[PDB]
Amino acid sequence: TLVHVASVEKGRSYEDFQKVYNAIALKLREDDEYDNYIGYGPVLVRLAWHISGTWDKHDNTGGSYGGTYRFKKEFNDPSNAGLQNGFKFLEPIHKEFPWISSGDLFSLGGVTAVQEMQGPKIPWRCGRVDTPEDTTPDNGRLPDADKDAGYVRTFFQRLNMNDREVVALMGAHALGKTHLKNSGYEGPGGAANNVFTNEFYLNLLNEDWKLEKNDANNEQWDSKSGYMMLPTDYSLIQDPKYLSIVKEYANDQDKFFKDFSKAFEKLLEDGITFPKDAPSPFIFKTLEEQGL
Ligand code: HEM
Numbered sequence: 586t587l588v589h590v591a592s593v594e595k596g597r598s599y600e601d602f603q604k605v606y607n608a609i610a611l612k613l614r615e616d617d618e619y620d621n622y623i624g625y626g627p628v629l630v631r632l633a634w635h636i637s638g639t640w641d642k643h644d645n646t647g648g649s650y651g652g653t654y655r656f657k658k659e660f661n662d663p664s665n666a667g668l669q670n671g672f673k674f675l676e677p678i679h680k681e682f683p684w685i686s687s688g689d690l691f692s693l694g695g696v697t698a699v700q701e702m703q704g705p706k707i708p709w710r711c712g713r714v715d716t717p718e719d720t721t722p723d724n725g726r727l728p729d730a731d732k733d734a735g736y737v738r739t740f741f742q743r744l745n746m747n748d749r750e751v752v753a754l755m756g757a758h759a760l761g762k763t764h765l766k767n768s769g770y771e772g773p774g775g776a777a778n779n780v781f782t783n784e785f786y787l788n789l790l791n792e793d794w795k796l797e798k799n800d801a802n803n804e805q806w807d808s809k810s811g812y813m814m815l816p817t818d819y820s821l822i823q824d825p826k827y828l829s830i831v832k833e834y835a836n837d838q839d840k841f842f843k844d845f846s847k848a849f850e851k852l853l854e855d856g857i858t859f860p861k862d863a864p865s866p867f868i869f870k871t872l873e874e875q876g877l
């Protein structure tokens with residue numbers, strides 16, 4: 586029964602949001618020591634996904650619109666352990682630009698991180714509006730990592746994502762790493778973990794993977810190169826339909842970039858009704874493109 590209409594922050598336009606993008610991007614460059622010099626890019630991408638991934642297509646609950654991660658129930662979701670680091674990073678940004686909504690800020694943080702890490706451009710639309718504490722979705726809507734391809738496929742149907750969209754989105758697991766204290770998994774998915782590339786797919790196909798137990802007594806796939814895959818990551822090469830798509834992205838960087846950009850924008854916009862006369866999506870310039 587539930588409609589969330591995008592409403593542009595009063596009087597704001599592209600230039601306002603480019604300023605917010607720039608402040609996030611400059612801080613990404615500045616605060617470079619975080620997580621053993623990985624920097625904040627990966628955790629900001631994960632934050633944007635987790636605030637969006639609570640969405641349920643069946644009743645339009647959850648989703649990025651309401652900015653509900655700011656409330657303790659969601660902030661404290663065991664599935665969100667570690668994301669507090671991303672939230673703290675964004676605090677001074679919100680202080681400088683207090684007019685931006687929380688959902689706009691969290692989602693823009695993810696777009697900025699992807700682009701600054703040399704990923705694809707992600708078109709982004711403003712107008713998410715903060716909603717009250719009672720609209721916060723319950724814990725348990727984000728996915729488990731110990732499961733198989735059938736679980737992944739069914740899970741993502743709730744977010745209206747198909748096989749191609751799922752495999753494209755999972756390529757973000759090239760970024761950052763798993764941390765034992767956060768999730769019960771430990772290690773990175775590859776070498777270039779603060780640069781956005783198609784390495785996730787190459788590593789799935791090319792590494793010699795061993796099913797091992799980590800120090801939290803959970804199974805994960807490890808390679809001699811020091812990379813790891815979650816059981817749900819590895820499921821993408823166990824299922825024949827996912828495997829074909831993995832091979833496609835391993836062999837076509839541009840196609841992966843284009844498909845990721847579409848799926849990630851869609852993820853960040855699920856649940857939102859944009860008026861016919863809403864502004865077109867914004868495509869922000871990187872700091873590099875601006876000579877900044
Ligand atoms: C089946 C679906 C997925 C599962 C089970 C899953 C699970 C996980 C787990 C367990 C971690 C480690 C968290 C930690 O220990 O800090 C992680 C990290 C991460 N995830 Fe996912 N994830 C999924 C999909 C996605 C998607 C769709 C995206 C975004 C498009 C994403 C982006 C990330 C990023 C960037 C990190 C690294 C964060 C950091 O380095 O701090 N994941 N994921």
Ligand SMILES: Nc1cc(N)nc(N)n1
Binds near residue numbers: 757763
């Ligand atoms: N988030 C990540 C990063 C990474 N390097 N590997 C995996 N499996 N997941």
